[PDB]
Design a protein around this ligand. Structure first.
Ligand SMILES: [Cl-]
Ligand SMILES: [Cl-]
Ligand SMILES: [Mg+2]
Ligand SMILES: [Mg+2]
Ligand SMILES: [Mg+2]
Ligand SMILES: [Mg+2]
Ligand SMILES: [Mg+2]
Ligand SMILES: [Mg+2]
Ligand SMILES: [Mg+2]
Ligand SMILES: [Mg+2]
Ligand code: NA
Ligand code: NA
Ligand code: NA
Ligand code: NA
Ligand code: NA
Ligand code: NA
Ligand SMILES: [Sr+2]
Ligand SMILES: [Sr+2]
Ligand SMILES: [Sr+2]
Ligand SMILES: [Sr+2]
Ligand SMILES: [Sr+2]
Ligand SMILES: [Sr+2]
Ligand SMILES: [Sr+2]
Ligand SMILES: [Sr+2]
Lengths: 154, 160, 95, 140, 186
RNA sequence: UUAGGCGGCCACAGCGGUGGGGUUGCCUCCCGUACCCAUCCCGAACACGGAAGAUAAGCCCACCAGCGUUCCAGGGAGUACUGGAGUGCGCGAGCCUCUGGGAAAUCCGGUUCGCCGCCACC
RNA sequence: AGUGCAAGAGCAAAAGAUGACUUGACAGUGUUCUUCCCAACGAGGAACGCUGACGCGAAAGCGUGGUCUAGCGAACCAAUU
RNA sequence: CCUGUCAAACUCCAAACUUACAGACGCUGUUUGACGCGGGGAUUCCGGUGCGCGGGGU
């Protein structure tokens, strides 16, 4: 399971690439989605590789992000342990976060919005013109690398 | 005409003589120089002139660079000296010129050029150990008459 | 194009590889297809008759009946539905 | 082993290449059967602007009609060594060509399942000379 | 053979066994083929249909299995040919085959020949095969009257092995009689 | 299939080559023209009739790789080329990095001297 | 090689050659594609059917002109069946 | 035998890639009716630029 975040806008972006992002439930910049690691899904992130930041998050980081940025399918409501307890098939945020990472369920399947609408990176990101290997923030990241990004976008 | 009009590979490969008529003859008199009866493996030293940039070299430039190179070898090693030089590239690309303004602009045939890629050997001379510094000078004169910058690389010779 | 005939720009698709030259095997020319069956459209260069318009080479239609010995195959050209009259010699079953 | 390998006369082709007919009557008198006309292809400048026209005549003789001809045809000419084919046939002169071969030649002349005769079963020039020398005349 | 561009014919064309152009025109009917083949000593007659991995023979008959019903006579002649066709045609009727088209292969369409006799036999057995009556031999040649009138020019016997002297084409009649009877073990 | 017939794929099956195999069996070559039929001339072929002889052809069986072909290994080569991205480099023609793909020639070593189907048959 | 003529393509027990026979270069009426990719538009063209009548062949079958892609023309008026 | 080069109108080879149909995932539709069909009204048929690939032309 990978965590996709849009870092580059829709203007001048190829239509087939913009459409892939919309199929992956990501419509705005800084929006995040939790995508399973299948053959079909791998082709999709590879197409979006230059306008995105992805990687497998840690249990800890996913838990922090779900607490602060997860929303129901409809409404304002906070997704805390008590919310997770009353509406999901899990006991707390940890049980949900574990199931997502192990690809047992999805946010939509559990009554939550597939999109985690994050805040801009605190202290800024490494840049939207270069990939990770060149000192930028685009493409595949390390688990430690994606965590720094998602935690900065609390 | 300047080489600025023909030095780049900006047009398609135009070589097909069964569709092109009135192609001027090649100004290149020789391709095999020196002792063409002796083998290339009979010489200890093999030095080549390597083109650094991908270019199109006209038959007039090829003849000028070959003439100024071989003439030095004839001067220093004699007319029947112990060497053999080879120009491995042939002028296949047929060249046009639009010589009415831009209407019916397809130009008439004016010449021929050799398409040489970067890193390729244009000239290759095979000499002995004592004649090595005379051939490096023949190539120094030869590179001044073609379009790109060049490397004078020694391929077979640890005699220094 | 310089001309707008049916066989324009068809040097490649309507020519055989030298080893596939000569008369084609009869087995595929007498193959029987049923209605609803998905068939691939590809002209056999060695067979003159029962061909379709070369623009349709590569299409995967659906057999929807027959006219004589030839077949009536339904395709979708872009967004337009067309019915192609084609013999078995130029058809191959999908899978 | 030797019976199915010993040569036989396949055909004796007696031909007359004229160019413009009257030579049909003398062939039927010396051979025994009926002759056939011969046409030619390609336009030649020696007053030969017609394609399908009688230029010559030929007679293909088989079995008894062949041997009874060769008993009176061979003592008329001096047979040489260079007068032989790579396949083992000879022509002399009125052109008299004799096609010699081994007993299994039907395999290359039949319609059903025909095959070309192997290089080993194909007659040699030397093996051909030996057969004729063994039948009423000299070689060299 | 010579290089990459060389075109080697199809295997059955290389072997000079199948006329592929005639095969297509034959297969166009949709009806099973009555494969009529010959040999120097024997005669074969098959009822072939089209299959996914190759041809399927539904009912065959060789002139060797003619002796099983009482044929003490030779197997590579006109009476043998008809009876081999009749035997193939009857086995075909038991297999459910009702109609066929005559395939003669690389044999010649010569009037009154053995392959047309194989055809006449199969039609007489109840099979509907597109034919031409005046291309078939006269009923007496099918009986073997041409072989009996050849034995009239005796002096030296025609048959080496003892069957008879002046030849009996009445054996043909005694065989067609046995096959037309439904009690027979096919 | 102790030699057959009809095929599918249509060279992995081609080209060339070595060895083996046939008393009432099979295929053949073979023997022979009264007939059906045949040759613009020839029972050569086609057609028909037949077994004195034969395994030399063909065919079937076993096998060889020199040529052609198929596939595989390792090398060439993650090279050539390339879909996506870049306030990366270059006066420029052009190149480079990241990401997703990925040859061809040739050399060496293997493979390949057909596979499969239906029928008939000591 | 040849296959009437550009070019590209197809064809070898043929689509080429020879020979013999024959007039399907037939009447009528369609389906479909093309013309006009997608996507509307005529004449023209082609493929593929049916009805009628024929030719050839043992028969399957082939023949809706020439192996395929050029060789074409509205309304009004005239002549013609 | 050896040795030196090429092809828009060459190809024993051969990508990336584009493309037909189908399944799966995704997204979308069944009160926001999608896909599709029928009808009314247009405007429009001087375009431009960047990038990739081009063709002509110094
Ligand atoms: Cl069509
Ligand atoms: Cl046969
Ligand atoms: Mg909401
Ligand atoms: Mg700040
Ligand atoms: Mg920055
Ligand atoms: Mg092309
Ligand atoms: Mg043997
Ligand atoms: Mg710059
Ligand atoms: Mg008017
Ligand atoms: Mg008039
Ligand atoms: Na003017
Ligand atoms: Na073919
Ligand atoms: Na004549
Ligand atoms: Na043998
Ligand atoms: Na029309
Ligand atoms: Na416009
Ligand atoms: Sr240009
Ligand atoms: Sr220079
Ligand atoms: Sr004979
Ligand atoms: Sr600049
Ligand atoms: Sr400059
Ligand atoms: Sr790979
Ligand atoms: Sr036609
Ligand atoms: Sr394209």
């Amino acid at each position: 399971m990978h965590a996709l975040v849009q870092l580059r806008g829709e203007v001048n972006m190829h239509t087939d690439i913009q459409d892939t992002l919309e199929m992956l439930n990501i419509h705005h910049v800084n929006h995040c989605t939790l995508v399973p690691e299948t053959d079909a899904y791998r082709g999709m992130v590879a197409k979006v590789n230059d306008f995105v930041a992805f990687g497998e998050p840690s249990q800890e980081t996913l838990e922090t992000v779900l607490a602060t940025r997860a929303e129901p399918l409809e409404g304002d409501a906070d997704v805390d342990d008590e919310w997770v307890a009353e509406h999901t098939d899990y006991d707390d945020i940890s049980g949900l976060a574990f199931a997502l990472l192990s690809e047992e369920t999805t946010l939509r399947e559990q009554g939550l919005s597939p999109t985690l609408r994050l805040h801009p990176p605190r202290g800024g990101h490494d840049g939207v013109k270069h990939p990770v290997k060149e000192g930028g923030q685009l493409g595949k990241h390390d688990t430690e690398g994606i965590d720094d990004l998602l935690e900065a976008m609390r | 005409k300047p080489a600025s009009m023909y030095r780049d590979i900006d047009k398609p490969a135009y070589t097909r003589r069964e569709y092109i008529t009135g192609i001027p003859g090649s100004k290149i008199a020789q391709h095999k120089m020196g002792r063409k009866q002796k083998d290339a493996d009979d010489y200890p030293v093999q030095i080549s002139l390597i083109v650094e940039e991908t270019v199109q070299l006209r038959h007039g430039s090829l003849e000028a660079s070959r003439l100024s190179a071989n003439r030095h070898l004839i001067k220093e090693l004699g007319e029947e000296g112990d060497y053999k030089m080879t120009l491995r590239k042939f002028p296949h690309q047929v060249l046009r010129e639009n010589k009415d303004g831009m209407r019916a602009a397809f130009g008439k045939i004016v010449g021929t050029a050799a398409r040489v890629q970067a890193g390729e050997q244009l000239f290759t001379a095979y000499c002995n150990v004592e004649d090595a510094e005379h051939v490096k000078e023949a190539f120094r004169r030869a590179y001044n008459k073609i379009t790109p910058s060049c490397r004078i690389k020694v391929e077979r010779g640890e005699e220094l | 194009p310089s001309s707008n005939g049916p066989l324009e720009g068809t040097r490649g698709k309507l020519k055989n590889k030298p080893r596939d030259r000569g008369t084609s095997p009869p087995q595929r020319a007498v193959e029987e297809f049923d209605d609803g069956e998905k068939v691939h459209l590809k002209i056999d260069p060695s067979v003159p008759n029962g061909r379709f318009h070369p623009r349709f080479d590569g299409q995967t239609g659906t057999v929807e009946g027959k006219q004589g010995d030839a077949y009536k195959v339904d395709i979708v050209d872009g967004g337009k539905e067309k019915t192609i009259i084609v013999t078995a010699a130029h058809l191959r079953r999908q899978e | 082993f030797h019976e199915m390998r010993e040569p036989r006369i396949e055909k004796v082709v007696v031909h007359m290449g004229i160019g413009h007919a009257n030579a049909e009557d003398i062939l039927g008198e010396i051979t025994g059967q009926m002759p056939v006309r011969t046409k030619a292809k390609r336009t030649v400048g020696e007053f030969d602007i017609r394609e399908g026209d009688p230029i010559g005549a030929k007679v293909t003789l088989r079995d008894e009609m062949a041997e009874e001809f060769l008993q009176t045809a061979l003592p008329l000419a001096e047979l040489a060594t260079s007068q032989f084919d790579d396949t083992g046939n000879f022509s002399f002169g009125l052109d008299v060509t004799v096609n010699l071969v081994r007993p299994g030649y039907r395999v290359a002349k039949r319609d059903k399942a025909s095959r070309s005769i192997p290089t080993k079963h194909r007659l040699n020039p030397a093996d051909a000379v030996a057969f004729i020398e063994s039948t009423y005349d000299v070689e060299v | 053979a010579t290089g990459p561009r060389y075109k080697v014919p199809m295997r059955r064309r290389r072997e000079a066994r199948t006329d592929y152009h005639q095969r297509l025109r034959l297969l166009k009917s949709g009806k099973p083929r009555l494969v009529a083949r010959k040999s120097n000593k024997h005669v074969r007659a098959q009822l072939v249909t089209l299959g996914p991995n190759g041809d399927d023979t539904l009912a065959s008959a060789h002139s060797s299995d003619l002796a099983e019903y009482g044929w003490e006579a030779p197997t590579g002649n006109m009476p043998s040919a008809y009876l081999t066709g009749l035997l193939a045609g009857l086995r075909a009727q038991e297999a459910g085959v009702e109609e066929a088209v005559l395939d003669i292969g690389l044999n010649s369409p010569t009037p009154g020949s053995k392959v047309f006799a194989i055809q006449e036999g199969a039609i007489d057995a109840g099979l509907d095969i597109p034919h031409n009556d005046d291309v078939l031999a006269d009923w007496q040649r099918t009986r073997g009257a041409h072989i009996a009138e050849y034995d009239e020019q005796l002096e030296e016997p025609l048959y080496s092995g003892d069957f008879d002297a002046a030849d009996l084409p009445e054996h043909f009649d005694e065989l067609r009689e046995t096959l037309l009877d439904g009690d027979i073990e096919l």
